[PDB]
Amino acid sequence: RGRRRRLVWTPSQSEALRACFERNPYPGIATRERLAQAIGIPEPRVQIWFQNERSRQLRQHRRESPEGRRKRTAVTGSQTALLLRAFEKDRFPGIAAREELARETGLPESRIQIWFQNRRARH
DNA sequence: CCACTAACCTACTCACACC
DNA sequence: GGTGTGAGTAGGTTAGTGG
């Protein structure tokens, strides 16, 4: 289980992220997609940052003191059956395995990761 | 050495289609 | 109401960044 290579923000990207977070710490998919392209970062990395930034901000605010969701990804029985056989072998695929499963299904890798998180909690 | 943090994780919830 | 499952939330853990 290897994780994806950790990126490192440029100052231009950091500024853009904080400015948008300041306006709304709960962006929807459209805001995240626009921001992602505006600063040259894949949208899933942006979503992960907004999650971490909120947990930061809430943790300091604890010791000092709705936009539209992504559209539901349609998953065929063909794709599900292939994800299910992978899931029985390994419930914690690394980035390589997720990228293989994304290639074989045609689904985005970020969606493969969510599918495994949900599947682990319910089976 | 060690503080910070992207990446990843659990747990619970919301959304929404379907019966 | 009940079921199923994709996408949200809070917040904890793992491992790379860089002082």
Side-chain angles (χ1 to χ4, degrees), chain A residues 87 91-92 114-123:
Chain A
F87 186 79
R91 316 203 315 162
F92 299 85
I114 291 305
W115 188 93
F116 271 83
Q117 296 182 13
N118 280 320
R119 183 86 189 180
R120 279 197 301 265
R122 296 157 169 169
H123 294 269

Side-chain angles (χ1 to χ4, degrees), chain A residues 54-105:
Chain A
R54 283 198 304 263
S55 81
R56 291 190 277 271
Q57 296 280 112
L58 287 173
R59 190 191 314 112
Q60 282 85 323
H61 254 283
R62 250 186 258 120
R63 283 193 304 277
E64 307 178 341
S65 257
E67 296 183 17
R69 292 186 182 185
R70 177 197 278 260
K71 271 145 168 109
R72 181 183 176 103
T73 307
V75 181
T76 72
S78 164
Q79 292 166 320
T80 302
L82 177 149
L83 295 162
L84 185 44
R85 297 183 295 262
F87 186 79
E88 307 157 0
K89 277 46 156 185
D90 185 13
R91 316 203 315 162
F92 299 85
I95 174 65
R98 297 195 300 272
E99 284 291 348
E100 165 160 29
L101 287 168
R103 171 176 58 75
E104 294 169 351
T105 54

